[PDB]
């Protein structure tokens, strides 16, 4: 018995087009259909410079924007050998972590709105509209902040942003507590989530989950502890790791990972060195407006970096960061030219949404939206 | 194993005046009345809402909204036709054609940003050498018809003169970065 | 005495040492079928001998873990059983030996990578206990 | 009787937040571009990162080389084996710093 389970609530899971082969109410197999959001991203990037390539990444995962620009930047610094300053690293993490918070605040309470709890959605989205007052203030666009450029980061924080991020972090433990007091204790929540989509660790490894769905099963594997790719080796934070694997562990993790991300934000705030914002290598970082206008040699680079590009040397690397969805890695083959060459984007949600087939076997049809909830399936990456 | 796991996870809470504590929580909703109480606290608290048309959300001088071609204080469009923004544009929205005007100084005969084919990433504002193209904080230009949304060659992007009073302010405050 | 492996699915095995001895003896016996002058057989022999030795010497699973610093004995059993699968697989489609042409181009690019880039750091040494 | 242990008193409504609106330049930021040692010393080939790298050394191995290497590898003694990334789980409630970071 085949059922074309589509997007239950649009605007939350946009193009979800499962084709469930059911058995009464018990689902026997879930066959997701991809491509409804397949923009030509892995082709369009081959046609544009390494700078023009960056805006696609904030548009790859639309609920955790800067994590993908941070995964791309670290793939055009893996090749460029472009050492970025300490302040660029600290800002880059303070925003990758603000993005982890922006994602878990959505991927928890959009999940909690698919399950049925209507209010956590709107509380978490007031919180997200506080964090977009930081995105929009530091770069310009509330969602797609093309801000974490290859060398360092686009431009320094405004002169009042750390004070505001602090005044937000002080009041954010309470918001997590409310999102938690409203959902963690509920017997209507546990019942809707405990023993739902349980993934034994061998399955989370096999299906390349590598995210909050690889730390549910108990595999202690965070690419901020495994492969520290910034000040992360300096910052202190504990990676919460589940013990059962059910969608109630992944929720409890995403609601603790939203507190450890608060620890990382507070650290990045309390220790942010007053250094240069971009790599001093002005052939990888366009010089400031003031310098390119006054200096002829800076003007030449501002011209050959906003038209030509880097021309990062010939290589091929797989740089993977811990994006909120999971291990978002961008395999970036680079022909010597200024344009990338098959900038393949390993995006979790392409490996997670595979897991829907075995996660939601023998679960009731109303659980198939809870699974899609805890996978944090955002179809931009799929 | 799940059978033994159940037996043990239920033999953990197996001492009187603990079975009673858990029974009371299930018998009289305790976690759920803590949900209702929080929900009530938020029902009575002030509302984080904004009656939009009259007051609008906070922005920043770096905010990227409607593209505006700036002008030099003494008229003379700031847009010398280098085509750097036409080059840097990721979506290739800007189409620039250049002609030595009769005065002799280069200028763009055609400077058409296609707003629909535009990602509002501010690359044009960065790439332009003289700050000729900047994004005005407008962001309120929803058009009834698509053809209007294609911003014509240097005529509608020349409406930035109205927004110059705010664009000049944002630039005077952002240029420090 | 072990309550549970934190990992889900890897069920705690009470008779860890015994099945480990069984698996490592099976592995030592089954590896004999691959040619001796193959790096795979030297490796299997060496680490299987080391783990079988440390499993015979020590008695508790905790001491097996402590000396043989390779995680948990349940994951060790997973590794040993997967190794037995591989040796019984390698017997088939035997890849041992090198054909005459053997063109293998080792390529080394030594460009240093910037430190602040994902670099898989080694992690704690078996002095974790 | 709820999640208010004198700590939710950090409430969401701020009412004094972004007190200095962004485009108001009370303090003019500076945002250093280059380190002071690299302002009047613009030698680049030393600082270069794009092109200052050893060239790719792609040398071929023929059967002789690999049989030599296989015969040279006499035994796989410990420390010729990849180290395990040891990570165990350990329950902790709020002990890191006392819940205050």
């Amino acid at each position: 018995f085949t059922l074309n389970f589509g997007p239950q609530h649009p605007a939350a899971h946009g193009v979800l087009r499962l084709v469930l082969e059911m058995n009464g109410e018990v689902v026997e197999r879930a066959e997701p259909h991809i491509g409804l959001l397949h923009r030509g991203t892995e082709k369009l990037i081959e046609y544009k410079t390494y700078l023009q390539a960056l805006p696609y990444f904030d548009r790859s995962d639309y609920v955790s924007m800067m994590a993908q620009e941070h995964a791309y930047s670290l793939a055009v610094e893996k090749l460029l050998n472009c050492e970025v300053p300490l302040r660029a690293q600290y800002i880059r993490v303070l925003f990758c972590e603000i993005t982890r918070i922006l994602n878990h605040l959505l991927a928890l309470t959009t999940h909690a709105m698919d399950v049925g709890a209507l209010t956590p959605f709107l509380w978490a989205f007031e919180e997200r509209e506080k964090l977009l007052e930081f995105y929009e203030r530091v770069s310009g666009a509330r969602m797609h902040a093309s801000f974490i450029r290859p060398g360092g980061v686009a431009q320094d924080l405004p002169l009042g942003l750390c004070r505001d991020i602090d005044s937000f972090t002080q009041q954010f433990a309470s918001r997590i507590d409310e999102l938690e007091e409203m959902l963690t204790g509920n017997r209507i929540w546990k019942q809707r989530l405990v023993d739902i989509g349980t993934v034994t660790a061998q399955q989370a490894k096999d299906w390349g989950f590598s995210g909050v769905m690889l730390r549910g099963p108990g595999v202690c594997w965070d690419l901020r502890r495994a492969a520290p790719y910034d000040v992360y080796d300096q910052l202190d934070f504990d990676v919460p790791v589940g013990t059962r694997g059910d969608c109630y562990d992944r929720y409890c993790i995403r609601i603790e990972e939203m507190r450890q991300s608060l620890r990382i934000i507070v650290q990045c705030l309390n220790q942010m060195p007053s250094g240069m914002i971009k790599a001093d290598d002005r052939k990888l970082c366009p010089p400031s407006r003031c310098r390119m206008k006054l200096s002829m040699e800076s003007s030449i680079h501002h011209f050959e970096l906003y038209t030509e590009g880097f021309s990062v040397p010939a290589s091929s690397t797989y740089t993977a960061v811990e994006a909120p969805k999971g291990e978002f890695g961008v395999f970036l083959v680079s022909n010597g030219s200024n344009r990338p060459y098959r900038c393949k984007i390993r995006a979790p949600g392409f490996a997670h949404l595979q897991g829907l087939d075995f996660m939601s076997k023998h679960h009731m049809l109303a659980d198939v939206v809870t699974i899609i909830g805890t996978q944090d399936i955002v179809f931009g990456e799929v | 194993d799940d059978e033994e796991a159940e037996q043990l996870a239920k033999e953990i809470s197996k001492d009187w005046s603990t079975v009673f504590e858990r029974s009371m929580n299930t018998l009289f909703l305790t976690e759920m009345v803590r949900g209702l109480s929080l929900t009530l606290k938020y029902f009575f608290d002030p509302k984080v809402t904004i009656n939009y048309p009259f007051e609008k959300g906070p922005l920043s001088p770096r905010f990227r909204g409607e593209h505006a071609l700036r002008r030099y204080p003494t008229g003379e469009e700031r847009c010398i036709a280098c085509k750097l923004c036409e080059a840097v544009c990721p979506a290739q929205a800007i189409t620039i054609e250049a002609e030595e005007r009769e005065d002799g100084s280069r200028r763009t005969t055609r400077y058409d940003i296609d707003m629909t084919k535009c990602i509002y990433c501010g690359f044009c504002q960065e790439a332009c050498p003289v700050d000729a193209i900047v994004e005005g904080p407008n962001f309120e230009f929803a058009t009834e018809t698509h053809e209007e949304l294609l911003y014509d060659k240097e005529k509608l992007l020349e409406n930035g003169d109205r927004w110059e009073t705010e664009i000049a302010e944002n630039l005077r405050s952002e240029s420090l970065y | 005495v072990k309550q549970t492996t934190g990992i889900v699915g890897l069920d705690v095995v009470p008779n860890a040492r015994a099945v480990l001895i069984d698996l490592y003896s099976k592995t030592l016996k089954e590896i004999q079928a691959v040619p001796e002058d193959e790096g795979y057989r030297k490796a299997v022999e060496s680490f299987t001998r080391q783990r079988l030795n440390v499993c015979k010497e020590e008695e508790d699973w905790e001491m097996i873990e402590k000396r043989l610093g390779c995680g948990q004995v349940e994951e060790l059993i997973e590794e040993a059983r997967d190794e037995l699968t591989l040796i019984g697989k390698m017997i088939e489609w035997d890849p041992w030996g090198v054909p005459d042409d053997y063109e293998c181009e080792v390529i080394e690019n030594d460009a240093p990578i910037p430190k602040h880039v994902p670099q898989h750091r080694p992690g704690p040494l078996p002095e974790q206990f | 009787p709820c999640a208010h242990p004198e700590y939710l008193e950090a409430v969401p409504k701020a009412t004094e937040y972004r007190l200095r609106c962004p485009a108001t330049i009370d303090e003019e930021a500076i945002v250093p571009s280059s380190d002071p040692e690299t302002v009047y010393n613009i030698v680049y080939h030393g600082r270069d990162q794009r092109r200052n790298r050893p060239p790719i050394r792609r040398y071929v191995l023929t059967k002789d080389n690999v049989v030599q290497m296989m015969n040279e590898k006499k035994s796989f003694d410990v420390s010729d084996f990849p180290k395990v990334y040891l990570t165990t789980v350990e329950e902790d409630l709020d002990t890191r710093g006392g819940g205050y970071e």
Binding site: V194, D238, P240, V241, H363, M364 | - | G6, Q128 | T87, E91
Partner: peptide, 24 residues
């Protein structure tokens, strides 16, 4: 249907961090 029902019993909540709390 003999499909495995979602048993809403489990072990009690105990926040499980990683071993790198104090000294890696």
């Amino acid at each position: 249907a003999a499909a495995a029902a979602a048993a809403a019993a489990a072990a009690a909540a105990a926040a499980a961090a990683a071993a790198a709390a104090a000294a890696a």
